[PDB]
Design a binder for this molecule. Structure first.
Ligand SMILES: NC(=O)C1=CN([C@@H]2O[C@H](COP(=O)(O)OP(=O)(O)OC[C@H]3O[C@@H](n4cnc5c(N)ncnc54)[C@@H](OP(=O)(O)O)[C@@H]3O)[C@@H](O)[C@H]2O)C=CC1
Ligand SMILES: CCOC(=O)CCCCOc1ccc(OC)cc1Cc1cnc2nc(N)nc(N)c2c1C
Length: 186
């Protein structure tokens, strides 16, 4: 199995969600960036795995689930089987990561991408080890009811460039945003 990574888009006031949806209007190139980054595997014969909480799964429109070309794993302690369209179900983040190591999957998974939401991000970010955060900074405040955990900049180094990631300011629907990549190793 290769790297562990989180990916997220976040407003200036650290918001990621409101009422089961994004706080901002759809940003279609932002979403194409998310798709490209999480689908692209730097290893032949393998695909990437995406891990998400239950609410995130149901927050993605039906037409776009499962996220295609990736193994989709949902986290829940209530569900008895993966949701309609998903591939795997685990009861903790530790369980999900062990599973990638099992022979069912050890040979098939390249990168792992945590794609939401708050609890899953927090636990990954505070777990010792090598971890990258792909963060899109939406450069406006948006009313939100769900927030991204604090990034400790003592541990997470902002990378000065990263292959495949544009460094300049993007804009769609009059909303400016920029891409960042952070890395810790502890
Ligand atoms: N802007 C962005 O980049 C993104 C934003 N979002 C936003 O996130 C919002 C919802 O996310 P959030 O409220 O944080 O939900 P979570 O990310 O915490 O998802 C958890 C859901 O699955 C189960 N679950 C929760 N935590 C775990 C866990 N640690 N292990 C296994 N299963 C778990 C359920 O909890 P239980 O254990 O009780 O079963 C819960 O319904 C959405 O409205 C969406 O808009 C989502 C993705 C990306
Ligand atoms: C193809 C036809 O066009 C369509 O129909 C497009 C539907 C798009 C809806 O996608 C939603 C919606 C609500 C939602 O959560 C509340 C999540 C997602 C998926 C998404 C989108 N952008 C992201 N950005 C970052 N940076 N990081 C992420 N993790 C990320 C994720 C996970």
């Amino acid at each position: 199995v290769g790297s562990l990574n989180c990916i997220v888009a976040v407003s200036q006031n650290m918001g990621i969600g409101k009422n089961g949806d994004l706080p901002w209007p759809p940003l279609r190139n932002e979403f194409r960036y998310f798709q490209r980054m999480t689908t692209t595997s730097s290893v032949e014969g393998k695909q990437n795995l995406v891990i998400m909480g239950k609410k995130t799964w149901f927050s993605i429109p039906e037409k776009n689930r499962p996220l295609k070309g990736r193994i989709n794993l949902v986290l829940s302690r209530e569900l008895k089987e993966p949701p309609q369209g998903a591939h795997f179900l685990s009861r903790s983040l530790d369980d999900a990561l062990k599973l990638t190591e099992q022979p069912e999957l050890a040979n098939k998974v390249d990168m792992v991408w945590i794609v939401g939401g708050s609890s899953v991000y927090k636990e990954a970010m505070n777990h010792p080890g090598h971890l990258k955060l792909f963060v899109t900074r939406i450069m406006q405040d948006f009313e939100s009811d769900t927030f991204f955990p604090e990034i400790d900049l003592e541990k997470y180094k902002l990378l000065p460039e990263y292959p495949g990631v544009l460094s300049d300011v993007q804009e769609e629907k009059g909303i400016k945003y920029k891409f960042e990549v952070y890395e810790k190793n502890d």
